[PDB]
Design a protein around this ligand. Structure first.
Ligand SMILES: NC(=O)c1ccc[n+]([C@@H]2O[C@H](COP(=O)([O-])OP(=O)(O)OC[C@H]3O[C@@H](n4cnc5c(N)ncnc54)[C@H](OP(=O)(O)O)[C@@H]3O)[C@@H](O)[C@H]2O)c1
Ligand SMILES: NC(=O)c1ccc[n+]([C@@H]2O[C@H](COP(=O)([O-])OP(=O)(O)OC[C@H]3O[C@@H](n4cnc5c(N)ncnc54)[C@H](OP(=O)(O)O)[C@@H]3O)[C@@H](O)[C@H]2O)c1
Lengths: 484, 484
């Protein structure tokens, strides 16, 4: 558009703004993806100047000697306004400043809330009362945490919704912005090969995985407040579940897609402790650097802490497509690898004519690292053999899509907020559903404080997780050898 | 087994025996696949000796300096008997010779008929009356041609069946012996991912392909007698159709599999000339060697010959699984490439939510060259794109199964004849069905002698073939770019 656009970084002083948001909008700017008439305004308490932000931020850019773009053009379109987060005059200074930009009164306004959540109500209120364009649209971008249980999430959401329409709320889950997570819809609904099999007649279980090989790395005090399931499971993994489980939406329109995701969530009952295994990492006596230290060997972590760093959990979607099909959600810190992944384990072929030599098919979408889709499969053993054996059909983006830059999540999503696309952004009802499922578990843990199961830095986590997966009907072999 | 085995090469003097069969049984011998107590007897008119066969044949072996195996051991187990193909005494000499081998009277007998078909009745009769073990099994291996129309195929089959049980008849189609052709059953019936889609609700058409880039190469007189459809279409391609179309058999047992193949064939009506395009190659004025010469520029080919070197033909299987689904059979000589292939083109996804940007899925099993299975597919365009585009999931045996020797068809099949496995061998009823489908077409051509459509050496054949495929509902794009 020819419309002017104002991207306000609320909290421009802090680390997220310095190392993520300023770089991200830079890169968007750099690549000709923003509107031409775009201005960046930072707002934080410190008495900063555009020079002080350039010095903070441009070591985090792709600083290249082609920097006319960077040359003030990007920074010339930057300004800064100092201000307190619940001082009304401050927001008049801000609004007034925005107004004095080129067509500032007309411009579309996009407020990035790069702030801690203890200030989200104040900032939000103040924006509403004093800083809203009266002509252009007004969009707010909010980061996790969105509450820490139902009731607290409800507080925040009822506040925001009183001030802003759903039209205006862009809650980011950086997961919706990943290449492979966006691909799920295309994989499923642009292809007949998948789809007729995408149901309980064919699938024995869905595994949704998120693994990190690093522990907590000095920041354990921060993590200890919420733990792994609040961290990763109620947001990222449950999102993947939704995209997997979704009925086909009426259209790609943002709210036809999101009302399929909530629809699924509504068929999932509160998770019971029968279906949970919790883990906390201890260090490896035979390890290297950080890997020697357990969760409790952070001096930032309170002594006797019970917080879990690993959780496997089994959910069920009580509907026609999925009745009975366990959805295993599996995540953790200080594990054997970095990986996030969707796997379908299909049922045994009916009426076996090979002689218990078949192995269940699997469909694997590996979100990270090394973006790949493959199906684990049966072929006839190459050569003089009459036997089936395990093989696969592969799409690996590394090799096929060799010269294709994949954007970072924040590049994609922030672009979506300019283009007005809420598809990849957690809706209010979605967020309620998410909290409903996990809240009574969460409180059970807070109350009764169960000892999580010990596992070694770099292991696959507690063995009890595997027994849970096996008990709901996952089958692990030993037999699938991959090469290349 | 410890049982003695006698492999008789009827026609040991000729080129097939010299360059295929002697080498093939050698290689089997060499690799420890035959029984220990195996003897090879050659039978032909010429007054030859084992020395004369060694000199003929061992340039066609993998002559390696590890040749104890070759050292007479292989040749020490060779003998030769001269004889006429309908002289009774000759078959007494032969039978008597077999008898004087170690446990020759007990031994299992396996007669390879490496002879021209003008002698198949004589040889067969003579074997039956004078050369059958009375203790061990007796198996005959017969090569195409099996007749040239129904009535002629019936003659031969009624002859053979009067003498031999079906138990005893191993009609070779070297196609059933290829790696990928054997794989079809495993691909289909060892995997849930395929299979629920393996039907008319999901498939728009099946393409069965067999292409050669060489013309006729001086041997056109031989080819001119039968033409392309007798050559390739009624055997190899119709076999692939059967393996594709087959209901799931009750067991891998040889005759539960073959009675699925005939079952399909029985739902296919005689092909009409509406559904046929015929081609004959002319040479390329802008070509290289042989490729400059048209079919008629062989002096071996009779002037004004009408024989077709290319044929596309559309068949239908009138049953529950396949009603309406065209099965396009496409083959030819002097084409753009060597290839044999199975392709399923799936229907459009129902209720499109992308915007006519989807392309039909395809499942490709490439039998030769470069044994591969892949599915052509839709993924989201990598990067900042919301669009689907064409991609694929690949199994390429070249890369995955890098160090795996694939045997030649004749190695596999002849081994099957020792192990007593008829699965990969054309049954009598099958062969009747095959002739029924094509015979009235064949005779129509013999009678009315239509001018085949000209196409250039190295082209994809006549463009009218593409119009036929498009008219029955194949859709070709232009858009699928593969790399690697
Ligand atoms: N080009 C490519 O991208 C490509 C294609 C095909 C295969 N590969 C590689 O080949 C390897 C094997 O493939 P795969 O992971 O799909 O097959 P796999 O080894 O069969 O993994 C199956 C799953 O079993 C789980 N599991 C449950 N109970 C288990 C137990 N008791 N013991 C062990 N594992 C148990 C594993 O958890 P974990 O997640 O904790 O292991 C894993 O998710 C991987 O490293 C993969 O990256 C790469
Ligand atoms: N690793 C691997 O093995 C691997 C994997 C994927 C792709 N590839 C390669 O990628 C290339 C493209 O793949 P593909 O052949 O499956 O896709 P394609 O180019 O879409 O071929 C589709 C089919 O369209 C037929 N056709 C019908 N009407 C046509 C018309 N008017 N113009 C052109 N073609 C028409 C072609 O006949 P023809 O058979 O005469 O061409 C062919 O069978 C191939 O060379 C393939 O070997 C290799």
């Amino acid at each position: 558009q020819s419309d002017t656009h104002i991207f306000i970084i609320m909290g421009a002083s802090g680390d997220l703004a310095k190392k993520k948001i300023y770089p991200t909008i830079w890169w968007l700017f750099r690549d000709g993806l923003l509107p031409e008439n775009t201005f960046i305004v930072g707002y934080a308490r410190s008495r900063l100047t555009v020079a002080d932000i350039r010095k903070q931020s441009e070591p985090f850019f792709k600083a290249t000697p082609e920097e006319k773009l960077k040359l003030e053009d990007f920074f010339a379109r930057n300004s800064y306004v100092a201000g307190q987060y619940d001082d009304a005059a401050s927001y008049q200074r801000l609004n007034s400043h925005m107004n004095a930009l080129h067509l500032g009164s007309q411009a579309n306004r996009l407020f990035y809330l790069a702030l801690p959540p203890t200030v989200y109500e104040a900032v939000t209120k103040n924006i509403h009362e004093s800083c809203m364009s009266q002509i252009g649209w007004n969009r707010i971008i909010v980061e996790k945490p969105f509450g820490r249980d139902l009731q607290s999430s409800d507080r925040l959401s009822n506040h925001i919704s009183s001030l802003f329409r759903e039209d205006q709320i862009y809650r980011i889950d950086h997961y919706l912005g990943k290449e492979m997570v966006q691909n799920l819809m295309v994989l499923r609904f642009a292809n007949r090969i998948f789809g007729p099999i995408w149901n309980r007649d064919n699938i024995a279980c869905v595994i949704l995985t998120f693994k990190e090989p690093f522990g907590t790395e000095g920041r354990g005090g921060y993590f200890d407040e919420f733990g792994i399931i609040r961290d990763v499971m109620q947001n990222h993994l449950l999102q993947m579940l939704c995209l997997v489980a979704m009925e086909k939406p009426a259209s790609t329109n943002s709210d036809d897609v999101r009302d399929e995701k909530v629809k699924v969530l509504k068929c999932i009952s509160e998770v019971q402790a029968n279906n949970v295994v919790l883990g906390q990492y201890v260090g490896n006596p035979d390890g290297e650097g950080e890997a020697t230290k357990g969760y409790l060997d952070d001096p930032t972590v309170p002594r006797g802490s019970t917080t879990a760093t690993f959780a496997a959990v089994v959910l069920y979607v009580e509907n026609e497509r999925w009745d009975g099909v366990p959805f295993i959600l599996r995540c953790g810190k200080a594990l054997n690898e970095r990986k996030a992944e969707v796997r379908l384990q299909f049922h045994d072929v009916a009426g076996d004519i090979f002689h218990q030599q078949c192995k269940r098919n699997e469909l694997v979408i590996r979100v990270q690292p090394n973006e790949a889709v493959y199906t684990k499969m049966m072929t006839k053993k190459p050569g003089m053999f009459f036997n089936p054996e395990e093989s696969e059909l592969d799409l690996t983006y590394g090799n096929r899509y060799k010269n294709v830059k994949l954007p970072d999540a924040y590049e994609r999503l922030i672009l979506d907020v300019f283009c007005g696309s809420q598809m990849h952004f957690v809706r209010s009802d979605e967020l309620r559903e998410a909290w409903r499922i996990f809240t009574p578990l969460l409180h059970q843990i807070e109350l009764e404080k169960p000892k999580p199961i010990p596992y070694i830095y770099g292991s696959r986590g507690p063995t009890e997780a595997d027994e849970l997966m096996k008990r709901v009907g996952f089958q692990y072999e030993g037999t699938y050898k991959w090469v290349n």
